[PDB]
Each structure stands twice: as C-alpha cells, then as structure tokens.
Symmetry: D2
C-alpha cells in the first residue's frame, strides 16, 4: 500500500535528527492518488509563546503533507519547493485535534501544484489554507 509506505515515511520522520522530526507526532488517516489526510494533536512542542499552533509549524505541515500527496501520484516525484503561501484564519489551541488535507491540483513536466487545508477535527472549521508549488527534476 501507498498507505503502508506513507506510514514508514512518518515513522522515519519521528526518529529523524533533521528538521523532519518536528512532525513526528502526526498520524495518517488516508492516502489516495494525489490526496493525503493526516491528523495531529496540538502539543507543547508544536506551539508558539502564546500557546497556539506555531505559524512556522503550520507552514511545515503544508510543506510536508503536500509533498506526501505528490509521492502518491503516478510519477511519485516529491520535487523541491518554489513558492508557498499560507493564510491563517483561526488559531489552533493546545490540546486541539487538527486534520491536514493535501490535494495535488495539477502536475506538469517540471512543476506540480498542491493545496492544503488544516481544519479543527471536532468542528471541521478551517484553521489555515496553503498553496505549494514544487519544481520536479
């Protein structure tokens, strides 16, 4: 399964020394062609100085989970980031369960385009939305 494989990727991230370690707490909900859903509980390690989800972590989720969606395509190339944007619509608080849903919008010869929504698991309310363009080598 691409599900079995994405689980191994997440396991690898957890024990990493590099920056991939910061998402070690995420869990995989589903993988499908060009679509990945993960979930995460907001813990202290994920927060800023005021106890909400750090905007840089949100960016890191947008980046990594969209990259996972790209792994889940026929080409399966993760690429390198070219442009990313994130809009922050509601805070995510410590202890809240969040859902991160990534979709591939379009794949070309040298560029891929993805979108990510972070939502509150309980309410489905949008926390943030991001778009991420990657260059494929």
């Amino acid at each position: 399964s691409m599900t079995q494989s994405l689980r191994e990727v997440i396991k690898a991230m957890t024990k990493a020394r590099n920056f991939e370690r910061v998402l070690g707490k995420i869990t995989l909900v589903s993988a499908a062609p060009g679509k990945v859903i993960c979930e995460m509980k907001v813990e202290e390690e994920h927060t800023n100085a005021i106890g909400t989800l750090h905007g840089g972590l949100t960016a890191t989720l947008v980046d990594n989970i969209s990259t996972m969606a790209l792994l889940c395509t026929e080409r399966g190339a993760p690429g390198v980031s070219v442009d990313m944007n994130i809009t922050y619509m509601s805070p995510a608080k410590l202890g809240e369960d969040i859902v991160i849903t990534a979709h591939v919008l379009k794949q070309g010869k040298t560029l891929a385009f993805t979108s990510v929504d972070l939502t509150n698991k309980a309410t489905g309310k949008l926390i943030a939305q991001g778009r991420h363009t990657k260059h494929l080598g």
Copy 2:
C-alpha cells in the same frame, strides 16, 4: 539596548520546550526600529531529507525574524500571522552560513506588513524571500 534585549529573547527561545526552540542556533547581528538582521549556520537539525535547509524552517525564520522586527517598533506589538508567502530561489546547503534580514514595510492601526530576505553570507545570493502580514495587537 534594543539589541541586548532581543539577544536575551533569542537566548530564551533556545531553552524553550515549544516550537520557538527550532531557531535555537540563530545569532543576532543588529536590531533597529523596524529592522532586524540575524545569522544562522545550517546544521543537521535544520535540514530536509536531501540535506538542504528545510523549506518549513525557512518559513519559521521568515515568521520569527519579521515578528522580532515588529517587536522593535514604537508600538512593539508582535501581532498574529494573517498571510505569509515564501519564494525559494536557491538551496542552502548543510554548513552554509545564512543571513536573515527582516524589515517592517508598513504599520497601521490593525495590520503590519513585513518582508524578509535570506541570503548566503559569503556570496550575498538570495536563498529565499518572504512577505508576512500580521493582525495587531
């Protein structure tokens, strides 16, 4: 001293249990009203799976260093992130020294606009540029 105060903040960040810990390695060059310059050496903890500066860490640098520039204004409100964008123009390799320069572009009643350049310290070449809008206070 504005620089000395901000240096102390950076030192505290280093000891944090929360996400602010991820920038523990940065050093402060200068603080002035609406302008902050930091430097960081890219180390393993900062990298992605291909050994370059992780795009989410770049995002976190844009976020935190622009927030520091807002702390260095008369109003001094850090705000909360509304929109951030980052463009990735060249990789920063493990062991490379980088400069992060943040400017406040405009401060209004309820919104502040900031921009950040990350450059290679040796060559001056642009690694990434971001813009970051925050809602005040």
Copy 3:
C-alpha cells in the same frame, strides 16, 4: 441576491473605470458567500500572444471574490490586503472559463476568500487564487 449581482455586473460593463475590463461576464449562481460566473475569452482579455492575460485573471479573482463578500449577511466588499494567484494552465482566445469564488472565513475586520478559474470544456484548473480583504 442573484438579481442584485446581475445588476452590479451590468453596471461594471458600462463603467469608465477599471471595473469595465470585465464587462463580458455571465452570473451563473449567487448564494451565501459563493458566486459562480463564466466568461468567454475575447481579444480584450488576452496578452500579446493571445492567451488570457495574467492581470485579467488577477482582476477576475479580485472582483468575483468581492462579489462573494457582497453575498454575505454583512455584505461589505472590503479593501484588498493580500492576494495570491497560482497559474496552472493557459486559457486561449475563444475558450469558456468558469470562475468560482467562495468565502472561507469572515470576521470583524478581515475576510478570506478563494477563487478557482476552470476551463468549462475540460474542467481543468486554469488558476487558483486566495484573497484577504480588510473590512471597515
């Protein structure tokens, strides 16, 4: 709501100001916080090489998202703070495009919207934008 928006579109068509550059659009649906329009790409909409001009796409994102904001309880159009657009496929002269705008979140001072432009024939995304506006 639909009738009001239809009239707005008629007014922009006849305008001397920049709102004129969309005169050629059709309202398909207006609902709470969601508007769907369509447009045939004509010469007036193209760049030097005859494809849909990126600034006109930007103008569609800006205007149609603002229309979605008009279709809310508050009904304030706001003023633009941040806009981004990702361009995925070209739209050629003569092609029909569907522009769908929706309100993601509304608050006291800020509103967030998203817009898709799609080729009607093929359903493929031409562009996607997001637009944050400040409310008075």
Copy 4:
C-alpha cells in the same frame, strides 16, 4: 540609454492593441537597465475601482507586466509565463496621484525566473503595494 529607448518603443507598440495590454497605455518608462525597470503612471478614472482608488487588479497587471519587462532586459531575455504571483496592498493610490513601479529580477535559472515589484507614491516615496512574480521560461 539605448536599452531604455528600445524598451520604450516595445511598450508604446504593445499598448496600442485591442488586447488587455491596452490598459497600460498611460504608463511612461523612466529607465531600463539589466534586470531592472522603472515606470511611472498617473492614476486616472480608467485606472480606478468603485471607490476612486487604483484598482487592485490593475496593480496586479502592473506587477505582471513590469516584472516581465525586467526579464526582457536580461541576457536570457525570455519573458516566460506566470507560475505564481502575490501582491500585498499597503496604502491606496488615489485618483490624480503619480506612482512609480519598480521591478527587478531576483534570480533566474534554466526554467524559472523570480522577480519583485514595488509600487510607490512618486511624491512621497511611500509604499503602495509590493508583489513577487515567478515565471517559467522553458
């Protein structure tokens, strides 16, 4: 310079068309140099929104076109096609105001080019908007 003269004639020619490039007919070129272009424009009724300020979509159009001109003023000289563009709006440009649009090339490579554009009030220097624009070259 010869470069400014060349670009000026490219602009005059391209803005006379029935196509969308016409909406920039009122811009004036100040200077073209390697990777950097400076234009100016007086905001008139045709440039405005329903509240009498510079229309956000025309600001985007200025960003797109003027950055593309900066790319033409390079050795590569490829205008490219837009991939990602963002704009941040800091202050209104009012009817009758002179604006300066300054575009510069940040970096270019084999297939991608990166540009940034500031719109400023000519008289006061203050920032109207700032955009960034990534284009695919081939």
